């Protein structure tokens, strides 16, 4: 019966540009090589050409 404070956060996850991002910051690009990329929060393994 004691009071509790409640916060509810809600968000979308992939839309029109990012506009709120996390605490990490960029590295420099490496091309023609297998990497694990991350652009605005969309990951994947590939080769950037």
């Amino acid at each position: 019966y004691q009071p509790y404070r409640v916060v509810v956060l809600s968000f979308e996850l992939l839309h029109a540009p990012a506009t709120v991002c996390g605490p990490k910051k960029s590295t420099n690009l490496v091309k023609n090589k297998c990497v694990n990329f991350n652009f605005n929060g969309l990951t994947g393994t590939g080769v950037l050409t």
């Binding site: 996850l13 992939l14 929060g41 969309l42 990951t43 994947g44």
Partner: protein
């Protein structure tokens, strides 16, 4: 006509196979890289399965 119908049936079957890669079958997404960039390993297994 009998030779063209073989090419038409072999192309409907390969187009259905590519189009089924955009179904989620009950998971939270159809993209495998968005399940892996949003869930920790125990929760992710139930969605990739």
């Amino acid at each position: 006509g009998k030779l063209q119908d073989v090419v038409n049936q072999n192309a409907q079957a390969l187009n259905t196979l590519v189009k089924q890669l955009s179904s989620n079958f009950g998971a939270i997404s159809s993209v495998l890289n968005d399940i892996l960039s949003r869930l920790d390993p125990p929760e992710a297994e139930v969605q990739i399965d």
